[PDB]
């Protein structure tokens, strides 16, 4: 197994995958690593085994059938990932907790939104469809851009988008387009 976190590249407290090499701190795996459980797989682990189950489910898709259906365990397990993704990008700790707003010249956003609310979001099962959680998820950029304005600081809201697109097309196997 590894010596670092696979989401925040950093030694600790860790708890390793048995069916991969990957380790986690304890509330860095999504959902948080789970009290007993020999063996214990990870998010990645039961990813593949989703898609191996059902090889078809890597066509195409269209991104409005995606967004509209039910979060059952699979498509919860799906966005627990998705988020889990984001947070492996260093650049996320500028999104992970709650923002404040005062900066001459702005307003502060009508509906803040951070990654660690739609962390809990997802754990308390407050979405009933994909749509409520990439909505969230798109907030929180928006947000940050809307707010920024011409400060160079708002491309930090254009990549970690970015990693969140890319990612979404990813797990979700949606229609590739030109
Ligand atoms: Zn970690
Ligand atoms: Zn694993
Ligand atoms: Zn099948």
């Not at 898609?51 to 699979?74: A, D, K, T």
Request: net charge neutral; glycine share 4%; charged share 25%.
């Amino acid at each position: 197994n590894s010596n670092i976190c696979e989401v925040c590249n950093k030694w600790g407290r860790l708890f390793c995958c048995d069916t991969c090499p990957r380790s986690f701190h304890e509330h860095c795996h999504i959902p948080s690593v789970e009290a007993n459980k020999n063996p214990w797989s990870c998010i990645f682990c039961r990813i593949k085994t989703i898609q191996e189950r059902c090889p078809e489910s890597q066509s195409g898709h269209q991104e409005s059938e995606v967004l509209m259906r039910q979060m059952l365990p699979e498509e919860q397990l799906k966005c627990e990932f998705l988020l889990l993704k984001v947070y492996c990008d260093s650049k996320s700790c500028f999104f992970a907790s709650e923002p404040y707003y005062n900066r001459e010249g702005s307003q502060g956003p009508q509906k803040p939104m951070w990654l660690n609310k739609v962390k809990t979001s997802l754990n308390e099962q407050m979405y009933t469809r994909v749509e409520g959680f990439v909505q969230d998820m798109r907030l929180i950029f928006h947000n940050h851009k809307e707010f920024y304005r011409e400060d160079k600081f708002t491309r930090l809201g254009i990549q970690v988008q970015d990693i969140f697109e890319k990612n979404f097309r990813n797990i979700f196997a949606i229609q590739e387009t030109s």
